[PDB]
Amino acid sequence: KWCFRVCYRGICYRRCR
């Protein structure tokens, strides 16, 4: 269980899996 910074269509975020 660790969070990370991810991106997509010109958009990024920080999801925790």
From Swiss-Prot:
Q: Which cysteines are joined by disulfide bonds?
A: C3-C16, C7-C12
Q: Where in the cell is it found?
A: Secreted
- Which residues does the record list as Arginine amide (modified residue)? R17
Q: In which tissues is it expressed?
A: Hemocytes.
Which family, according to UniProt?
A: Belongs to the tachyplesin/polyphemusin family.
Function recorded in the entry: Significantly inhibits the growth of Gram-negative and Gram-positive bacteria.
Task: Return the protein name.
Answer: Tachyplesin-1
| Highest classification ranks of the organism | Eukaryota, Metazoa, Ecdysozoa, Arthropoda, Chelicerata
Which residues of the entire protein appear here: the answer is 24 to 40 of 77
